[PDB]
């Protein structure tokens, strides 16, 4: 259940 | 008092973001703001992205803020203010789908 999009930054 | 009519709206939710761009508003690509009700009160930026499959729709962004100073939705860049990241964002998008509202209210 997300609440938000948090920019990622993962490979 | 930032803009408080274009990126932002002030202490807005996302329930009230989403049928505030859906109900008479704007296009897709705007970019609202607002606090958000999820913590003590961070901020919010909401955005605005109709399809042709569904009709109009809503996202959001919780914006966060360093204790520091330092207004940030993610953490790969954060301001001073919502007028001042609002300005940079209005040149990038900062990482997210899209940058604050693209067009102008007016």
Known sequence: ?11 | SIQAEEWYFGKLGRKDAERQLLSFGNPRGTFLIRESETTKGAYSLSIRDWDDMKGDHVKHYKIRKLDNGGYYITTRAQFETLQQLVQHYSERAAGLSSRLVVPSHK
Do not use: A, G, N, S
């Open chain 1, 1 to 11: 259940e997300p609440q938000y999009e948090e920019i990622p930054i993962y490979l």
